[PDB]
Amino acid sequence: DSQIQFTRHASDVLLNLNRLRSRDILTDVVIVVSREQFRAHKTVLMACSGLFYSIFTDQLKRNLSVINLDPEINPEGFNILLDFMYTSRLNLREGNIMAVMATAMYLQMEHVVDTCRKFIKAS
Amino acid sequence: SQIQFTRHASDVLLNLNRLRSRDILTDVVIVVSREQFRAHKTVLMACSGLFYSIFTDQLKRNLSVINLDPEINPEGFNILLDFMYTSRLNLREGNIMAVMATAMYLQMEHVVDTCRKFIKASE
Numbered sequence: 026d027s028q029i030q031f032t033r034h035a036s037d038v039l040l041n042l043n044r045l046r047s048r049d050i051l052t053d054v055v056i057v058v059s060r061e062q063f064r065a066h067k068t069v070l071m072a073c074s075g076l077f078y079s080i081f082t083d084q085l086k087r088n089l090s091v092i093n094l095d096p097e098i099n100p101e102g103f104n105i106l107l108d109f110m111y112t113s114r115l116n117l118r119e120g121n122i123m124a125v126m127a128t129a130m131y132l133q134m135e136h137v138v139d140t141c142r143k144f145i146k147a148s
Numbered sequence: 149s150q151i152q153f154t155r156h157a158s159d160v161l162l163n164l165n166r167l168r169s170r171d172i173l174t175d176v177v178i179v180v181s182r183e184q185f186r187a188h189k190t191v192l193m194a195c196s197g198l199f200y201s202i203f204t205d206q207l208k209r210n211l212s213v214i215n216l217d218p219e220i221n222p223e224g225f226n227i228l229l230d231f232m233y234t235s236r237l238n239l240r241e242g243n244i245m246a247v248m249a250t251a252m253y254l255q256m257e258h259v260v261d262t263c264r265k266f267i268k269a270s271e
C-alpha cells in the first residue's frame with residue numbers, strides 16, 4: 026500500500042493549461058479591459074481570482090463569452106496578472122508595481138497584493 | 149525581477165478539483181462501462197495522452213460524451229481521474245494492476261512508471 030504525492034504534477038498541469046491558452050484551445054471567454062481583449066479559460070480565472078470566482082459562479086454570467094471589466098483598470102497590470110495565473114511567475118517592476126497592486130486588489134488576488142506590499146517595503 | 153510563487157500551481161489544481169466537485173463548467177462526460185464521470189476537457193488534455201489525442205482530433209474534439217473501452221475498470225478510472233485533479237495516487241496491492249493498465253490506456257507515463265516502481269518494491 027502506498028499513497029503517493031507527485032510533487033511536479035500541478036506545475037505540469039498548469040504548464041499544459043498555459044500551452045492550451047497560448048494556442049487558443051478551449052478558451053471560452055474574452056476579458057475586455059479598456060484598450061485590450063484577453064482570451065482565457067474561465068476555470069483558470071475562477072481558480073486564481075476572487076472576482077472571477079464571483080462572476081462565473083453567478084448563473085446569469087457563467088455562460089457569457091465576453092466579460093467587460095472596469096475600464097479604469099490598467100490593461101498592462103491585467104496582462105501581468107493573467108500571465109501570473111498561468112505560470113506562477115509575477116513580473117513585478119518599479120515601473121509596474123502600483124498598477125499590478127491595484128489590479129490585484131480589484132481581481133481579489135491576496136497573495137499578489139501582499140507580495141506588492143513586500144516589494145514596497147523593500148523599495 | 150520575475151518572482152516565483154511555489155504553491156500557486158497546487159492551489160489552482162485544488163480549486164479546479166473543487167469546480168469539478170460542484171459540476172461547474174464541466175464540459176464532458178466520460179463513460180466507463182456502466183459508470184459516468186464529469187470533467188473538464190482542459191484538465192483531461194493536460195494529464196493524458198489519450199485525452200489530448202481525442203480532443204485534438206477533428207472528428208472527436210466537439211463530443212460532449214466520450215465512451216472509453218468497456219474493459220477499463222471504473223474504479224481504476226476513478227483513481228486516475230482523482231489523481232489528475234489532486235496529484236495524489238491511491239496505490240495498493242489490490243488495485244495496482246487495474247491502475248497500471250488504466251494508466252497505460254490513458255497514456256499517463258509517470259503513473260505507469262510509478263506502478264512499475266510499486267511492483268519493484270512489492271513483487
Ligand SMILES: Cc1cc(-c2cn(CC(=O)Nc3cc(N4CCOCC4)ncc3Cl)c3ncn(C)c(=O)c23)cc(C#N)c1O
Binds near residue numbers: 072134157164
Ligand atoms: C492560486 C491563487 C488563488 C487565488 C485566489 C483564488 N480565488 C478564488 C477561489 O478561491 N476559487 C475557488 C474556490 C473554491 N472553494 C471551494 C470551497 O472551499 C474553499 C473555496 N472552489 C473553487 C474555486 Cl475556483 C480567490 N478568492 C479570493 N482571494 C482573496 C484570493 O486570493 C483567491 C489567489 C492567488 C494570488 N495571488 C493565487 O495564487
Ligand SMILES: Cc1cc(-c2cn(CC(=O)Nc3cc(N4CCOCC4)ncc3Cl)c3ncn(C)c(=O)c23)cc(C#N)c1O
Binds near residue numbers: 037
Ligand atoms: C501532468 C501530467 C501530464 C501527463 C501527460 C499529459 N499529456 C498530454 C499533453 O502532453 N498535453 C499537452 C501538450 C502540449 N504540448 C504543446 C507543445 O508541445 C509539447 C506538447 N500542450 C498542451 C497539452 Cl494539454 C501526455 N501525453 C502523453 N503522455 C505519455 C503523458 O504522460 C501525458 C501525464 C501525467 C502522468 N502520469 C502527468 O502527471
Ligand SMILES: [Cl-]
Binds near residue numbers: 091
Ligand atoms: Cl460584462
Ligand SMILES: [Cl-]
Binds near residue numbers: 152153154155156
Ligand atoms: Cl510561495
Ligand SMILES: [Cl-]
Binds near residue numbers: 026240241242243
Ligand atoms: Cl491491498
